Design a protein around this ligand. Sequence first.
Ligand code: HEM
Length: 152
Amino acid sequence: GLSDGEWQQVLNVWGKVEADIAGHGQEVLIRLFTGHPETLEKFDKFKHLKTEAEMKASEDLKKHGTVVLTALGGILKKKGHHEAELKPLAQSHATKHKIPIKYLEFISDAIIHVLHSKHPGDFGADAQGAMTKALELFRNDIAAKYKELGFQ
Ligand code: HEM
């Protein structure tokens, strides 16, 4: 649950992402894959990537980064009223991709890391607080659907 002022911070930060969605999406996935190499094994189309240089050179990884952040941005713009947008993603990630909630924690922290890396000194403590709360809400509502499905 976020206040109006917190949502305003989230959507202000998101403007930074929308200026370069592919570059942000690429770096988020690279941070996930290099920090948590077990996550790469869930992607049949990226498991061939052995080095970060190959990851950086992969145009399909940048494409998928655009898909991921476009979906997340659509959810964030609903300011919590995201049941219709979130349900299909919860279902596909639990039942088809088999993504444990832990990996959603990993990618949430990766987003925070990338924002500081690309905007050092321009991602203030209030903005980090609000973005963190928004990603916690996203993860918590996914977790509720995971529990319904019995997925661990
Ligand atoms: C912010 C969190 C995430 C968002 C918004 C997101 C979004 C998406 C979307 C929109 C798709 C394509 C449609 C679909 O299959 O539902 C997708 C596919 C997929 N996601 Fe995610 N995802 C997220 C996190 C993760 C994480 C953490 C993992 C694994 C560590 C993951 C694994 C996958 C896989 C394996 C696919 C299929 C890729 C393919 O072969 O095309 N997702 N995701």
